[PDB]
Amino acid sequence: QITTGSKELDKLLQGGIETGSITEMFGEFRTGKTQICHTLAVTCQLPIDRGGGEGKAMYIDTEGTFRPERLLAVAERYGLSGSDVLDNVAYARAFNTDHQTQLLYQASAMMVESRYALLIVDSATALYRTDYSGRGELSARQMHLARFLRMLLRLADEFGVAVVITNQVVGNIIAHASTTRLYLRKGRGETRICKIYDSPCLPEAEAMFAINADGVGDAKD
Amino acid sequence: GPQPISRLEQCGINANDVKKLEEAGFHTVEAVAYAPKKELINIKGISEAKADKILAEAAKLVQITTGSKELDKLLQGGIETGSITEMFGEFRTGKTQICHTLAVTCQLPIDRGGGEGKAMYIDTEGTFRPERLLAVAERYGLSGSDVLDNVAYARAFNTDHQTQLLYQASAMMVESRYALLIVDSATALYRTDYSGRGELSARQMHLARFLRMLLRLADEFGVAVVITNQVVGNIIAHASTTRLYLRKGRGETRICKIYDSPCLPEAEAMFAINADGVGDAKD
Amino acid sequence: GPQPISRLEQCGINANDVKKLEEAGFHTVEAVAYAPKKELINIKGISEAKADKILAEAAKLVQITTGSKELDKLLQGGIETGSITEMFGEFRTGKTQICHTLAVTCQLPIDRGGGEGKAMYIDTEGTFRPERLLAVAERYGLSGSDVLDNVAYARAFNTDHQTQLLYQASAMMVESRYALLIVDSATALYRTDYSGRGELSARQMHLARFLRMLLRLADEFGVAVVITNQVVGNIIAHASTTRLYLRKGRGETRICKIYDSPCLPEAEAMFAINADGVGDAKD
């Protein structure tokens, strides 16, 4: 299983995210989903005993919030090389949903040629909400996302990746196909509150985490 | 530097289609490998099967002073080389003079508030002025005649060549150490070129390509990128590594505010505009 | 520098299509090389393949005194050469006389608040006479007869004919230095032709292309553009680089406000209208 980079959130996940599974997180604006995912992007490279996956991360960014220096800091926290971490976190920003789905093809085709532990899709719904913002064409956006989600599940079996996706609330289409969902709340400080929203296999319990200097970790409060 | 698209011929694509890619301005294999199949398919005779081959075979290969100490102190030293910055506000709040000051000063040593290199001035609005460039050059001690060319120039008058100039830079911006790129009134062409309210999806998808190439160039050559936005959106707030609002007082008195950033707090600084470019709020 | 469309014909486009570009407002390669296909396709008789050929072939190629020192001091020197500036105002504000003043004074030495060149005077309204210019010229010390030659006059009754007079400007403005470009009651031919409520989108498109023509010409030749407008559209309030509001002060004395300008101060100045043109008020 692959570590979220919090011992608490992993013990809530009964050891971390599964190789061969989809999981999601959502919450309020500026709750650090990218910093959880930047941690995951390094930690999936680790030995499996560390909650590792001994393989690369895909970083399907939607929003341009990816930076090398956060990955350098997370790398040296785990004792990994920062430049190995940059070489192990494949980056390109999907500017639209078609580009997000094409980046599942870039991911999968080149993942025949290399071992990935993880796929990140960061603010995934923002592209669906900016290419198809209006109520006029919802079945096209939704079936383009149903394709994208089948492809996530297909990749998770085809290459063994854990798949993590990140979402915005002030949709319900993912609630059955996902194997666990997380809710993030707005606790005080750079410390934040995490809870399992639902899981068919895990407790509805809580974990406390923080944005540290070295990405997301367990709360050091 | 990048893998130039000429090499893709050794990877397998016929040289005629590689020249049709270079005529699309797609002068690097990297500068297509990070983009969707549509942008290749849209090139005449380069079909779906040729875009499949192009991208499969591509994997064989793939701080500047504003002239104001106070505005540079809002910028925590001035514009960082290897970034996008955006400033937005009403007409004449400063855009053209901000750009003319930065386009010169990027040629300075980094310690003197530079980026150690050339500028590109993608002028959407025809407000390039040699007089104004020379006034900054003689103030900051740069060669005035060389400033007129080290500020490499073209007027843009649709978003397409505003953007295809970034693909021309996928050649030209290899050829020296550009410190800077300016697109001046960058958003205005998305408002002139797609103005009927049945046409807005074309503004969106074309703006995505533009902002993609800006941040690419910032990663590919280490340029700072400055984009100036007219007022009388959130995708540009994403692409801009920090955002800025421009305002005014009586006289030529100006204020800037940081309004969006994952890295910097919301903060404000006071400045002015002078016969010798952008400067501090002196009296 | 500027990019004239007189280069396009020799590439393979027939001269009468280049004349349709000029008479539609695309006076320049700086209006057809970097432009959307739809804008070329909208012109009478020009096909999509001819728009393609126009683009492919063009891609082979590529302050004045108002006469009142107080209103000029509000303008921090006067009307800017190489800009659009709009004045809009109430009934009997004498707007033609402001225009006849500017038409004379643009010919003067720049240090006198001149412009060192001719004016175009596109008319909509028949308020011009040669006599108006004669009595103005003799204040500023210009010859009244040469002032008529320096104020190229024609009236339009419709906005196509008016656009054709901007074609006459675009061709003839190469033969002498123009400092100014007047269109007197510029909005009024849109109001005569497009009074039908539903036609506002076609007025806005025709007027937007016309405002661009004025801007290209200002960028091509360094002309100030002066356009006079009527109080009971808002496209001119941001297509002009600063807006001026005229009200009915007492007698021929009229109040000006800088109604919006994030650079020039948004204050007021008082001026009189005379046979000698616009001057400062005396009590």
Swiss-Prot record, chains B, C:
Motif, Nuclear export signal: chain positions: 207-222
Gene3D superfamilies to which the protein is assigned, alphabetical: 5' to 3' exonuclease, C-terminal subdomain, P-loop containing nucleotide triphosphate hydrolases
Disease: Breast cancer: A common malignancy originating from breast epithelial tissue. Breast neoplasms can be distinguished by their histologic pattern. Invasive ductal carcinoma is by far the most common type. Breast cancer is etiologically and genetically heterogeneous. Important genetic factors have been indicated by familial occurrence and bilateral involvement. Mutations at more than one locus can be involved in different families or even in the same case.
Induction of its expression: Stress-induced increase in the mitochondrial levels is seen.
Superkingdom as given in the UniProt entry: Eukaryota
Residues annotated with Phosphotyrosine modification: Y34
UniProt source species: Homo sapiens
Keywords: Acetylation, ATP-binding, Chromosome, Cytoplasm, Cytoskeleton, Disease variant, DNA damage, DNA recombination, DNA repair, DNA-binding, Fanconi anemia, Isopeptide bond, Mitochondrion, Nucleotide-binding, Nucleus, Phosphoprotein, Ubl conjugation
Sequence position, cross-link Glycyl lysine isopeptide (Lys-Gly) (interchain with G-Cter in ubiquitin): K38, K44
Name of the molecule in the record: DNA repair protein RAD51 homolog 1
Modified positions (Phosphothreonine) in chain numbering: T253
